[PDB]
Design a protein around this nucleic acid. Sequence first.
RNA 1: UGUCAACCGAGCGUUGAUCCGAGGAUGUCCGAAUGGGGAAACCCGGCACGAGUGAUGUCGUGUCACCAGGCGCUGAAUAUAUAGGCGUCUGGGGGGAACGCGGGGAAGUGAAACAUCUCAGUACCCGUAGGAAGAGAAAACAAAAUGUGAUUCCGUGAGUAGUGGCGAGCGAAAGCGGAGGAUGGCUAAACCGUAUGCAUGUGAUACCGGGUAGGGGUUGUGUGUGCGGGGUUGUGGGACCUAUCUUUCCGGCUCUACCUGGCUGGAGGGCAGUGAGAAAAUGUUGUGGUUAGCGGAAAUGGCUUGGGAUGGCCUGCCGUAGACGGUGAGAGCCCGGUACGUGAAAACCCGACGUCUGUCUUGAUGGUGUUCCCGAGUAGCAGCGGGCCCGUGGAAUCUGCUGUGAAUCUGCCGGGACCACCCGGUAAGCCUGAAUACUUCCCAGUGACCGAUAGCGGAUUAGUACCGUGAGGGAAUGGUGAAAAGUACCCC
RNA 2: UUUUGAAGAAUGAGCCUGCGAGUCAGGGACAUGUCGCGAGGUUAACCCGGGUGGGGUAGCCGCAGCGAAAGCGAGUCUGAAUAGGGCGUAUCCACACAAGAGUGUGUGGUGUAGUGGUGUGUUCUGGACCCGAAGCGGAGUGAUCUACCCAUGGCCAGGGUGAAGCGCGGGUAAGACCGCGUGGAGGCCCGAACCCACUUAGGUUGAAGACUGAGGGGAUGAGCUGUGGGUAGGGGUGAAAGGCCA
RNA 3: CCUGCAUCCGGUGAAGCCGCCGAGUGAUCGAGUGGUGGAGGGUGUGGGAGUGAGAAUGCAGGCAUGAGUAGCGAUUAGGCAAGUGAGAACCUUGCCCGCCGAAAGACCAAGGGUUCCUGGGCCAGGCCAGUCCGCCCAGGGUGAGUCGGGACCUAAGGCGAGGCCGACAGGCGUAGUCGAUGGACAACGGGUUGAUAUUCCCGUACCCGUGUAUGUGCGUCCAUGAUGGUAGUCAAGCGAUGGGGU
RNA 4: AUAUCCUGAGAGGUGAUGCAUAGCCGAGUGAGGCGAAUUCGGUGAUCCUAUGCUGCCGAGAAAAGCCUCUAGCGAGGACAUACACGGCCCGUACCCCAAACCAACACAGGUGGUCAGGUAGAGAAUACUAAGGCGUACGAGUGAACUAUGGUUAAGGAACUCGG
RNA 5: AACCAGUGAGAAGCGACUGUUUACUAAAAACACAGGUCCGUGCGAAGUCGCAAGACGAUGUAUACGGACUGACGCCUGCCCGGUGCUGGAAGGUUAAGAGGACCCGUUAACUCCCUUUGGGGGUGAAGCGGAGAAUUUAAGCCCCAGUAAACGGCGGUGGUAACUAUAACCAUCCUAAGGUAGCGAAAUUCCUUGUCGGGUAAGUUCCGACCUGCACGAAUGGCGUAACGACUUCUCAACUGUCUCAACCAUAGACUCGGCGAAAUUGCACUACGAGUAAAGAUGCUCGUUACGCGCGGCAGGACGAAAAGACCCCGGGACCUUCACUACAACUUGGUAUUGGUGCUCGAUCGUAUUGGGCCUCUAACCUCGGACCGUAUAUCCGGUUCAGGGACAGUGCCUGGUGGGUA
RNA 6: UGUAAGUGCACAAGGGAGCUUGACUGCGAGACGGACAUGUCGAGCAGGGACGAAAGUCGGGACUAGUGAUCCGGCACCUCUG
Length: 63
Amino acid sequence: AAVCDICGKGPGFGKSVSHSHRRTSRRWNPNIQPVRAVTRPGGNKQRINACTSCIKAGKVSRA
RNA sequence: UGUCAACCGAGCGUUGAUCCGAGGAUGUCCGAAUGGGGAAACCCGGCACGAGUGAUGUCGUGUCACCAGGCGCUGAAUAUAUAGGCGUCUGGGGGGAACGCGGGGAAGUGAAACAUCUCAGUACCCGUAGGAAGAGAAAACAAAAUGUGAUUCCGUGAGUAGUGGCGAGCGAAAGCGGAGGAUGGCUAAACCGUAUGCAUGUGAUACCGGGUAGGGGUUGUGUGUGCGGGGUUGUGGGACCUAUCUUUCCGGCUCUACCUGGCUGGAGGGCAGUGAGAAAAUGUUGUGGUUAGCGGAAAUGGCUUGGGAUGGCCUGCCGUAGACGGUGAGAGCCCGGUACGUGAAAACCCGACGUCUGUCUUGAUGGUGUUCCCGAGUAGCAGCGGGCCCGUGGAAUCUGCUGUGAAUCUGCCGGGACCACCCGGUAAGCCUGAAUACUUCCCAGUGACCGAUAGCGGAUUAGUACCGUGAGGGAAUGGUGAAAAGUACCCC
RNA sequence: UUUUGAAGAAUGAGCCUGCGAGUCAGGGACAUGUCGCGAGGUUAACCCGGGUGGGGUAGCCGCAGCGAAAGCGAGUCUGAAUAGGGCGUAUCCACACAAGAGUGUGUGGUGUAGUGGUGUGUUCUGGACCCGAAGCGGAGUGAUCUACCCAUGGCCAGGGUGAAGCGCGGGUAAGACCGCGUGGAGGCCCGAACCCACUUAGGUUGAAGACUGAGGGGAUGAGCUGUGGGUAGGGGUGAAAGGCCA
RNA sequence: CCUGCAUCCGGUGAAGCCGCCGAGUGAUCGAGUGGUGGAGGGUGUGGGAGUGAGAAUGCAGGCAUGAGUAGCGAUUAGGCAAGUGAGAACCUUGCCCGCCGAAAGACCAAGGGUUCCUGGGCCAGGCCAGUCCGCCCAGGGUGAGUCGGGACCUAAGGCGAGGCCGACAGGCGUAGUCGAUGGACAACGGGUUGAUAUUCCCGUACCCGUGUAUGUGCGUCCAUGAUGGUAGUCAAGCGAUGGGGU
RNA sequence: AUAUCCUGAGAGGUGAUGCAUAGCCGAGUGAGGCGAAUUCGGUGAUCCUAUGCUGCCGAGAAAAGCCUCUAGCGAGGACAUACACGGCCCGUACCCCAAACCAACACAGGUGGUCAGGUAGAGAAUACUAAGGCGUACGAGUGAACUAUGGUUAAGGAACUCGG
RNA sequence: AACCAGUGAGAAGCGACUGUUUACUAAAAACACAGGUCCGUGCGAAGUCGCAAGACGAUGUAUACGGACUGACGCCUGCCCGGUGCUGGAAGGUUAAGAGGACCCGUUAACUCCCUUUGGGGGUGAAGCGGAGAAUUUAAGCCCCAGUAAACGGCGGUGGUAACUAUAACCAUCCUAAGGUAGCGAAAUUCCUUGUCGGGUAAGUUCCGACCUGCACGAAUGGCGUAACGACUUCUCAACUGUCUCAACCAUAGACUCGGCGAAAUUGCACUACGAGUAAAGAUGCUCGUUACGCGCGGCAGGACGAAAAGACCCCGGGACCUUCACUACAACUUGGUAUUGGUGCUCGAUCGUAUUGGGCCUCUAACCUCGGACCGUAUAUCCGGUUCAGGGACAGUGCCUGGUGGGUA
RNA sequence: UGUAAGUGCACAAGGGAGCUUGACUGCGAGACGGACAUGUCGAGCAGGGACGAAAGUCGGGACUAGUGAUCCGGCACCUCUG
Ligand SMILES: [Mg+2]
Ligand SMILES: [Mg+2]
Ligand SMILES: [Mg+2]
Ligand SMILES: [Mg+2]
Ligand SMILES: [Mg+2]
Ligand SMILES: [Mg+2]
Ligand SMILES: [Mg+2]
Ligand SMILES: [Mg+2]
Ligand SMILES: [Mg+2]
Ligand SMILES: [Mg+2]
Ligand SMILES: [Mg+2]
Ligand SMILES: [Mg+2]
Ligand SMILES: [Mg+2]
Ligand SMILES: [Mg+2]
Ligand SMILES: [Mg+2]
Ligand SMILES: [Mg+2]
Ligand SMILES: [Mg+2]
Ligand SMILES: [Mg+2]
Ligand SMILES: [Mg+2]
Ligand SMILES: [Mg+2]
Ligand SMILES: [Mg+2]
Ligand SMILES: [Mg+2]
Ligand SMILES: [Mg+2]
Ligand SMILES: [Mg+2]
Ligand SMILES: [Mg+2]
Ligand SMILES: [Mg+2]
Ligand SMILES: [Mg+2]
Ligand SMILES: [Mg+2]
Ligand SMILES: [Mg+2]
Ligand SMILES: [Mg+2]
Ligand SMILES: [Mg+2]
Ligand SMILES: [Mg+2]
Ligand SMILES: [Mg+2]
Ligand SMILES: [Mg+2]
Ligand SMILES: [Mg+2]
Ligand SMILES: [Mg+2]
Ligand SMILES: [Mg+2]
Ligand SMILES: [Mg+2]
Ligand SMILES: [Mg+2]
Ligand SMILES: [Mg+2]
Ligand SMILES: [Mg+2]
Ligand SMILES: [Mg+2]
Ligand SMILES: [Mg+2]
Ligand SMILES: [Mg+2]
Ligand SMILES: [Mg+2]
Ligand SMILES: [Mg+2]
Ligand SMILES: [Mg+2]
Ligand SMILES: [Mg+2]
Ligand SMILES: [Mg+2]
Ligand SMILES: [Mg+2]
Ligand SMILES: [Mg+2]
Ligand SMILES: [Mg+2]
Ligand SMILES: [Mg+2]
Ligand SMILES: [Mg+2]
Ligand SMILES: [Mg+2]
Ligand SMILES: [Mg+2]
Ligand SMILES: [Mg+2]
Ligand SMILES: [Mg+2]
Ligand SMILES: [Mg+2]
Ligand SMILES: [Mg+2]
Ligand SMILES: [Mg+2]
Ligand SMILES: [Mg+2]
Ligand SMILES: [Mg+2]
Ligand SMILES: [Mg+2]
Ligand SMILES: [Mg+2]
Ligand SMILES: [Mg+2]
Ligand SMILES: [Mg+2]
Ligand SMILES: [Mg+2]
Ligand SMILES: [Mg+2]
Ligand SMILES: [Mg+2]
Ligand SMILES: [Mg+2]
Ligand SMILES: [Mg+2]
Ligand SMILES: [Mg+2]
Ligand SMILES: [Mg+2]
Ligand SMILES: [Mg+2]
Ligand SMILES: [Mg+2]
Ligand SMILES: [Mg+2]
Ligand SMILES: [Mg+2]
Ligand SMILES: [Mg+2]
Ligand SMILES: [Mg+2]
Ligand SMILES: [Mg+2]
Ligand SMILES: [Mg+2]
Ligand SMILES: [Mg+2]
Ligand SMILES: [Mg+2]
Ligand SMILES: [Mg+2]
Ligand SMILES: [Mg+2]
Ligand SMILES: [Mg+2]
Ligand SMILES: [Mg+2]
Ligand SMILES: [Mg+2]
Ligand SMILES: [Mg+2]
Ligand SMILES: [Mg+2]
Ligand SMILES: [Mg+2]
Ligand SMILES: [Mg+2]
Ligand SMILES: [Mg+2]
Ligand SMILES: [Mg+2]
Ligand SMILES: [Mg+2]
Ligand SMILES: [Mg+2]
Ligand SMILES: [Mg+2]
Ligand SMILES: [Mg+2]
Ligand SMILES: [Mg+2]
Ligand SMILES: [Mg+2]
Ligand SMILES: [Mg+2]
Ligand SMILES: [Mg+2]
Ligand SMILES: [Mg+2]
Ligand SMILES: [Mg+2]
Ligand SMILES: [Mg+2]
Ligand SMILES: [Mg+2]
Ligand SMILES: [Mg+2]
Ligand SMILES: [Mg+2]
Ligand SMILES: [Mg+2]
Ligand SMILES: [Mg+2]
Ligand SMILES: [Mg+2]
Ligand SMILES: [Mg+2]
Ligand SMILES: [Mg+2]
Ligand SMILES: [Mg+2]
Ligand SMILES: [Mg+2]
Ligand SMILES: [Mg+2]
Ligand SMILES: [Mg+2]
Ligand SMILES: [Mg+2]
Ligand SMILES: [Mg+2]
Ligand SMILES: [Mg+2]
Ligand SMILES: [Mg+2]
Ligand SMILES: [Mg+2]
Ligand SMILES: [Mg+2]
Ligand SMILES: [Mg+2]
Ligand SMILES: [Mg+2]
Ligand SMILES: [Mg+2]
Ligand SMILES: [Mg+2]
Ligand SMILES: [Mg+2]
Ligand SMILES: [Mg+2]
Ligand SMILES: [Mg+2]
Ligand SMILES: [Mg+2]
Ligand SMILES: [Mg+2]
Ligand SMILES: [Mg+2]
Ligand SMILES: [Mg+2]
Ligand SMILES: [Mg+2]
Ligand SMILES: [Mg+2]
Ligand SMILES: [Mg+2]
Ligand SMILES: [Mg+2]
Ligand SMILES: [Mg+2]
Ligand SMILES: [Mg+2]
Ligand SMILES: [Mg+2]
Ligand SMILES: [Mg+2]
Ligand SMILES: [Mg+2]
Ligand SMILES: [Mg+2]
Ligand SMILES: [Mg+2]
Ligand SMILES: [Mg+2]
Ligand SMILES: [Mg+2]
Ligand SMILES: [Mg+2]
Ligand SMILES: [Mg+2]
Ligand SMILES: [Mg+2]
Ligand SMILES: [Mg+2]
Ligand SMILES: [Mg+2]
Ligand SMILES: [Mg+2]
Ligand SMILES: [Mg+2]
Ligand SMILES: [Mg+2]
Ligand SMILES: [Mg+2]
Ligand SMILES: [Mg+2]
Ligand SMILES: [Mg+2]
Ligand SMILES: [Mg+2]
Ligand SMILES: [Mg+2]
Ligand SMILES: [Mg+2]
Ligand SMILES: [Mg+2]
Ligand SMILES: [Mg+2]
Ligand SMILES: [Mg+2]
Ligand SMILES: [Mg+2]
Ligand SMILES: [Mg+2]
Ligand SMILES: [Mg+2]
Ligand SMILES: [Mg+2]
Ligand SMILES: [Mg+2]
Ligand SMILES: [Mg+2]
Ligand SMILES: [Mg+2]
Ligand SMILES: [Mg+2]
Ligand SMILES: [Mg+2]
Ligand SMILES: [Mg+2]
Ligand SMILES: [Mg+2]
Ligand SMILES: [Mg+2]
Ligand SMILES: [Mg+2]
Ligand SMILES: [Mg+2]
Ligand SMILES: [Mg+2]
Ligand SMILES: [Mg+2]
Ligand SMILES: [Mg+2]
Ligand SMILES: [Mg+2]
Ligand SMILES: [Mg+2]
Ligand SMILES: [Mg+2]
Ligand SMILES: [Mg+2]
Ligand SMILES: [Zn+2]
């Protein structure tokens, strides 16, 4: 739950602000889920972490 | 025949010692440690080739990690195939004082308190290479001037325009003047060829510019990929037809033989070359400098005090050399050397002079109307955060994440919301030296800087003794005199 | 020294020789002397000179001010108002006009002085006269004593107390129960080593940075101890006292 | 005090120190004189100061009183004759007396590294003097097929090829290899020098390996046998990285 | 069935015509030579049989080695005797209930384990003692008070002290 | 016969016993201890450490495990559900993000009047581009209603009503939830207190047994007893003794002289009297007066505000830790939307059949999930990966925004 | 004699009656006391009003208490900017 193995999108770091205008540390992590990639026509897939961006763009096929 | 620091015994050298300059071998063990093991410098092996004993026991020289990337073989449950397994080559594991790039990232303290702020993007950490790095060829400014023309670094522009519990504080840009010259080059798209596959075929009147004609595969027609031409831009450009001008020879092809228009090979003549624009090697110069050395001028002058003249008085000489040190007391002419001249076996790097490599000349020049192209989850939009003076405020621009999601030249984006008219430009791919930053080391120089409680903690046994089981802390100790001639000898 | 008030019984001083304290940086600011120039002064960054010298007009202040502005100008803003007011035209004298509500309104003159270096007092930003804590964060180091647990050994001198069970003689129909011999279960009892620390006297510039002399509790267990291992600081551990962590 | 400039002094004695004599309204001065010394100084006028001490329970070094006062670190206690030598209650020899004796004795592991022996001396140390020493100097000294460890095996635990997770840094744990306080494993008595002893010697034992010779002696090539009975295997001898006992 | 096997204390023979010793001679920092008897009883273990046996519950390491089995290799190997050989690396002095270790010291503390004689004694307590080792590092004198550790004391016995 | 070698009894209080604790002032009435009750846990559990895998719980499965209060054994364990938590009913009101676009304006196409010639100067209006943007939708929390005291908690005063004196020993007044059941009581609780009564010696503010006037005893922060036990606290009795009237004597190690070595704290100065005075209010050091040869040794300690640690007690200023309905945040938990995210069916609505795009429910498998079984990588593997079989399944988990609880942390 | 006290008012500022909103706009010569900013009075000018024939008075209440800076923001208008 860190980075997409394909596009390598790492998490970004920022500062969270309360309604009292006081600052504090917080982190944002890109949406990535475990899916079996469709790359070989042979009909075999392997467990690889992927990101919604790559999945929806189809860089790893759906089948 | 190094040195602390005398002393003895031993020896070499004119047949060139010692010394210094360049290159070359050996180089026990640990230390990324990598034959295996482990509490640093200590224990135990395999394999091959040699040495030794009547044979084991023994001994010498090689070789015996891991990971990643190529290449070859092999193909499990399981069939296609993969994972996995073997053989062989190429690379990497650590260290380094400062200098860079991208991230993470704190608390003391001011506001006479303090949450926002500031301290500060500081200390520290992480991943990273170099001798420098990064950045870089406008989707840039400005405003009606017919302006500038890549980037970087300094001085102004000013403590102003702004911002802030409008407190404490924080802080630009444009333009202008300087250092440098390369206002440089590459790459995917529009279309033909070629190894292919996936396909399907009316498998025959379609593939080839016209005419004579032979046939049914340069597949008849589509798709994705590797390989060579033609193109690289803003007054838009590039691909197709249509006229004009056309600065070597020959061959094979445009299905085929014959004329017309195109594709490709073999030979002049230019073009550059270690180069960012393509890469590899091989044949002949600079008293270019550097790593040592060598030459190098003139008073034993006289008189005086003296232990000692390098002190005082009087006479000389050199000066392309009166910088600086030593010598028994302040030395141009005593010594070391200074001005100046020379000077290298080997090696270094620079520059210049020579085989070889490769694009183009099958090609270039100025026009025309039509059909296709100009960098995809991108630009923009909505939500949540950063840093620009802008501390969400009307919020421009850049950027991180999540959803939605566009077009190809009367297209698109920019001139601090936004609309209309004007003006500039062509992002979503990649390289690019010169102007700049720094010294752990070496060479040469300087001090209205310190002289032993000062000066680096360290002028001597120095990061030693010592303290602490640890990170770590951290001490004080120079002057005899010209030479030791360091007081023979006698006496208590 | 600090005190309104002290020779003090308010503090500092054993003696001696050394070491120890209003400086620096910036074209900063105000003020004050000093030198050139004079309606100008004035150079940065950067070039050429073993050298302090010579170039370098990019910049900054006075030269006109008023008004938030479109602007205007010896005037200007407020304003319906030459109608009074706010700011400015260096200052002055003289000449005329008004009231003499103190002064103002119009003409002519002498005519204005600022700017660069530098000495000195203060001030701005750097810790800015000298020295002086309890505490915070980041990064690292310790469970060899002390707490707990884990694997593996050793340790407890002597002497008493006698459950179940068992066999025999009684009781019963069988028992419970009644006596007789064996057994040593006991977080049982008295008492060594070891371990603990209750009272008491000494020590207190001690022999010892927490002991000694007399007495005091366990001693087969929640026992004692050796060997090697694990537990890291807003945390560990803790038969729980706000203890321990060299 | 250091410096630019111009001057003067100095082995016929420059700088500090200790006196005498004097001098200015002050911080002081003397080119006026005496002893010590041996190597650089003064005046005039400019520029720059780490430029002037008595106190902060200041710091480095040296030294005052209490002071020739307390103590000289237990629960046993010495005495005598002789010797050595300059020195003897503290050293050597001999004779009495006392103390300890679940230790105040004889040993192992951990712990230190030359404290062990021989020879030399007694300015450093021993709480006093020392001929003595756990002071130092110079030399010498440590002997394993069988004792403790390694080459044999394992635990609580540590490392960790692959791998999982994690923004990076990093946390986990498989196969394996490390880790005695355990298991198995083969020697005892006596003698010996100034220091070594299950180690050397004497006497007698035990456990693994290699070579040669000899004797039992069995097969490969013949072939009986048992068979499942022509033919195909075979039970010799080794025997596990595997199974099962211990 | 004391069948058969295993184990196995203790006893007995061998090791040993050897070694050592009480003692006798000369000989002294000491060495040399010679060298007797060595039978029977009592007491009695914390040591052996013993990983035994009997009770109890809180219910009690692994690997290696050894034996065996085949799988599998296999034509030389097994046994016995004799002769002649090899058997690897580190630890090895001295100090150990302390003047040599832990405590700043030549310290009134601590430090795991093994040896345990005689007499009285229940004893590994207590008293004197053998083997064995010590007189441990400032001394000599002196009826002061006072201090501290002991010893004794008429009659009352707790009347002091907050408190036997 | 030396040495060695337990005083005993009678009560009360507290605790059931043996045990453990503040190294270095406190060993207890403190702590735990076996008994019980309640709460929570359906199994890669809850609870943990760890942002994650994973590990413990357990190589176990409610006749167990985690949390809480109590403490052997005997007789027992009263009333109250308003407030706050917890478990249920959310059947209504309220509101976040997101969907949604009533109306409005800016903008110039087109224009509405003069004014020219080739849309502005004095208002209408299309599209596109933008802005605030309203009504409708929502889920949680909050308000509403029941249960729970071995959950945190509370359990009063007021008046009247006996045969002579004594008071309430029944009824009603306010309130809320009721206004102390058993048991005990001048106690480890009691200020007025040495309360009153009986025991104890001559004397008893201690002690023992009772009296109820319980400021301010009380039954799971338990009450009253209780065999045995306690280096726990208080009192009484016999024996004893130098603890006393009342002290005396003897020995050891110092204290003392002699010999040797040789110590520390402090220190402004010194040929450092006293009586009465004088002052920063207590004088060796000042005024008047009295006394007093110089220098030592052994003894005693009133003074020299003697030595020790920049006073702990007080205040000022600044820290640290702690508590909560003080403020502001965070972790964690929890609610919806949205992406991951698929197909077919029933059922509810805003331009009784006609149009509305979002809710509720049931199904199917391919996404996805399972510390389920069997095989292979594999000689040794409870790791890991792959194939297959078997179950869940468009949920859950996880990204982004958001509403709530939140002394667990800052 | 509205609201406490004092100072005043018998001429009125006590009461009664008719009309009317000067409880205006643009200004202000000078003084009052104050460390600072806050606080107090005022003659007189112009516009356009009120009362009164006129002379004349009116910039709230016989007098002294009935209140609050800075910053930020809202509303109307403006011959400012853009
Ligand atoms: Mg990731
Ligand atoms: Mg950041
Ligand atoms: Mg912050
Ligand atoms: Mg060399
Ligand atoms: Mg070599
Ligand atoms: Mg290695
Ligand atoms: Mg290694
Ligand atoms: Mg590779
Ligand atoms: Mg296949
Ligand atoms: Mg590196
Ligand atoms: Mg403050
Ligand atoms: Mg503050
Ligand atoms: Mg900043
Ligand atoms: Mg480089
Ligand atoms: Mg660039
Ligand atoms: Mg770029
Ligand atoms: Mg600027
Ligand atoms: Mg400031
Ligand atoms: Mg091309
Ligand atoms: Mg191209
Ligand atoms: Mg001379
Ligand atoms: Mg001369
Ligand atoms: Mg010179
Ligand atoms: Mg010389
Ligand atoms: Mg010189
Ligand atoms: Mg020379
Ligand atoms: Mg902002
Ligand atoms: Mg904004
Ligand atoms: Mg604009
Ligand atoms: Mg243009
Ligand atoms: Mg472009
Ligand atoms: Mg540069
Ligand atoms: Mg000196
Ligand atoms: Mg250390
Ligand atoms: Mg002062
Ligand atoms: Mg004073
Ligand atoms: Mg004063
Ligand atoms: Mg005074
Ligand atoms: Mg005094
Ligand atoms: Mg004082
Ligand atoms: Mg004082
Ligand atoms: Mg004071
Ligand atoms: Mg001093
Ligand atoms: Mg001192
Ligand atoms: Mg200033
Ligand atoms: Mg000035
Ligand atoms: Mg001047
Ligand atoms: Mg005026
Ligand atoms: Mg800290
Ligand atoms: Mg550790
Ligand atoms: Mg029984
Ligand atoms: Mg018994
Ligand atoms: Mg007893
Ligand atoms: Mg003592
Ligand atoms: Mg200490
Ligand atoms: Mg004691
Ligand atoms: Mg004791
Ligand atoms: Mg006693
Ligand atoms: Mg005892
Ligand atoms: Mg007792
Ligand atoms: Mg007991
Ligand atoms: Mg016990
Ligand atoms: Mg550690
Ligand atoms: Mg407590
Ligand atoms: Mg401690
Ligand atoms: Mg000088
Ligand atoms: Mg001279
Ligand atoms: Mg001289
Ligand atoms: Mg002289
Ligand atoms: Mg001299
Ligand atoms: Mg001068
Ligand atoms: Mg001067
Ligand atoms: Mg200066
Ligand atoms: Mg100074
Ligand atoms: Mg001084
Ligand atoms: Mg000192
Ligand atoms: Mg003293
Ligand atoms: Mg004394
Ligand atoms: Mg004494
Ligand atoms: Mg002693
Ligand atoms: Mg003697
Ligand atoms: Mg004894
Ligand atoms: Mg004994
Ligand atoms: Mg003993
Ligand atoms: Mg040891
Ligand atoms: Mg050792
Ligand atoms: Mg010795
Ligand atoms: Mg000697
Ligand atoms: Mg000596
Ligand atoms: Mg000494
Ligand atoms: Mg020696
Ligand atoms: Mg050996
Ligand atoms: Mg492991
Ligand atoms: Mg690895
Ligand atoms: Mg691991
Ligand atoms: Mg190991
Ligand atoms: Mg071991
Ligand atoms: Mg031995
Ligand atoms: Mg026995
Ligand atoms: Mg051998
Ligand atoms: Mg060895
Ligand atoms: Mg030895
Ligand atoms: Mg030793
Ligand atoms: Mg030793
Ligand atoms: Mg010992
Ligand atoms: Mg020591
Ligand atoms: Mg000692
Ligand atoms: Mg000791
Ligand atoms: Mg011990
Ligand atoms: Mg014993
Ligand atoms: Mg004795
Ligand atoms: Mg002895
Ligand atoms: Mg005494
Ligand atoms: Mg006594
Ligand atoms: Mg008597
Ligand atoms: Mg008596
Ligand atoms: Mg009394
Ligand atoms: Mg009493
Ligand atoms: Mg009670
Ligand atoms: Mg007890
Ligand atoms: Mg306890
Ligand atoms: Mg404790
Ligand atoms: Mg204590
Ligand atoms: Mg203690
Ligand atoms: Mg205590
Ligand atoms: Mg206790
Ligand atoms: Mg107790
Ligand atoms: Mg307890
Ligand atoms: Mg109960
Ligand atoms: Mg229980
Ligand atoms: Mg319960
Ligand atoms: Mg769980
Ligand atoms: Mg409970
Ligand atoms: Mg209780
Ligand atoms: Mg209790
Ligand atoms: Mg209720
Ligand atoms: Mg309720
Ligand atoms: Mg309530
Ligand atoms: Mg909407
Ligand atoms: Mg609720
Ligand atoms: Mg309610
Ligand atoms: Mg009572
Ligand atoms: Mg009671
Ligand atoms: Mg009471
Ligand atoms: Mg009382
Ligand atoms: Mg009483
Ligand atoms: Mg009493
Ligand atoms: Mg109470
Ligand atoms: Mg309760
Ligand atoms: Mg209850
Ligand atoms: Mg009781
Ligand atoms: Mg009595
Ligand atoms: Mg008596
Ligand atoms: Mg007496
Ligand atoms: Mg006597
Ligand atoms: Mg004595
Ligand atoms: Mg004494
Ligand atoms: Mg004495
Ligand atoms: Mg002495
Ligand atoms: Mg003092
Ligand atoms: Mg007085
Ligand atoms: Mg007095
Ligand atoms: Mg006083
Ligand atoms: Mg006096
Ligand atoms: Mg006095
Ligand atoms: Mg006097
Ligand atoms: Mg007088
Ligand atoms: Mg007299
Ligand atoms: Mg006193
Ligand atoms: Mg005092
Ligand atoms: Mg204090
Ligand atoms: Mg305070
Ligand atoms: Mg804290
Ligand atoms: Mg959503
Ligand atoms: Mg979703
Ligand atoms: Mg989507
Ligand atoms: Mg709160
Ligand atoms: Mg807190
Ligand atoms: Mg009236
Ligand atoms: Mg008004
Ligand atoms: Mg005025
Ligand atoms: Mg008027
Ligand atoms: Mg007026
Ligand atoms: Mg008025
Ligand atoms: Mg009126
Ligand atoms: Mg403010
Ligand atoms: Zn991706």
